[PDB]
């Protein structure tokens, strides 16, 4: 498949930001719940 160059190029810095934000969106909420597991188990 051939394609044209990116209309709005995503630089390495921009990709690090998107990857970091993506990983954090998954890891933070679950991490919070898992961390407070004991506080939940008996309360």
């Amino acid at each position: 498949i051939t394609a044209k160059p990116a209309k709005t190029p995503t630089s390495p810095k921009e990709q690090a930001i998107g990857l970091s934000v993506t990983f954090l969106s998954f890891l933070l909420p679950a991490g919070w719940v898992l961390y407070h597991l004991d506080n939940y188990k008996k309360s």
Partner: protein, 46 residues
């Protein structure tokens, strides 16, 4: 009638890659987080 072409045949906007990142983060993040919060809900009832 409707808009056609790349980035126009979808229910979400891709005009701004950062606003898009926020949307995708909420979309996929809410899905992944739901089970953890339901588990938390079940633990905090009894």
């Amino acid at each position: 009638h409707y808009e056609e072409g790349p980035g126009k045949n979808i229910p979400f906007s891709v005009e701004n890659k950062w606003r898009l990142l926020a949307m995708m983060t909420l979309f996929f993040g809410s899905g992944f987080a739901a089970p953890f919060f339901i588990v938390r809900h079940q633990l905090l009832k009894k």
